Amino acid sequence: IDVLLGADDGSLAFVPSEFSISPGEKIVFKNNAGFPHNIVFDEDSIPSGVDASKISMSEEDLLNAKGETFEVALSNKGEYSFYCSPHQGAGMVGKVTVN
Ligand SMILES: [Cu+]
């Protein structure tokens, strides 16, 4: 599943921001507009026992250039909330459900 980092109109959003997937399916987060961006899973809002570091950028890490990507596949079922660190308050957040 491809997820744009920044919408095509410049909005500071993941597109899509809420979506499902099945275990092992690639998520490719791609810098689109308004970069730098990053993808951080919220360590308090992911499934029991999941290591957020295995699936996240750190908050200090950035994707700098247009078209740069961060790929992650999730395994464990349940809800995972994530955000872009520098743009979280602007509303650049999302939630993926592994089902
Ligand atoms: Cu961002």
From Swiss-Prot:
Instruction: State any single GO MF term.
Output: electron transporter, transferring electrons from cytochrome b6/f complex of photosystem II activity
Electron transport found in the keyword field: yes
What is the purpose of this protein?
Participates in electron transfer between P700 and the cytochrome b6-f complex in photosystem I.
Specify which residues bind Cu cation according to the UniProt entry for this protein. Answer: 37, 84, 87, 92
Instruction: Please indicate if the UniProt record lists Cell membrane as a keyword.
Output: no
Alphabetically sorted, this entry's keywords are: Chloroplast, Copper, Electron transport, Membrane, Metal-binding, Plastid, Thylakoid, Transit peptide, Transport
- Where the record annotates domain Plastocyanin-like, the positions are 1-99
- How is this protein named in the record? Plastocyanin A, chloroplastic
Name the family: Belongs to the plastocyanin family.
What is the originating organism of this protein? Answer: Populus nigra (Lombardy poplar)
Give from-to of the shown chain within the full protein: 70 to 168 of 168
Cellular localisation? Plastid, Chloroplast thylakoid membrane
Gene label: PETE
Q: Which cofactor does it need?
A: Cu(2+)
Recite the UniProt cofactor note for this protein: The crystal structure with reduced Cu(1+) has also been determined.
Give membrane topology per the record.
Peripheral membrane protein
Disulfide cross-links: none
GO cellular component entries: chloroplast thylakoid lumen; chloroplast thylakoid membrane
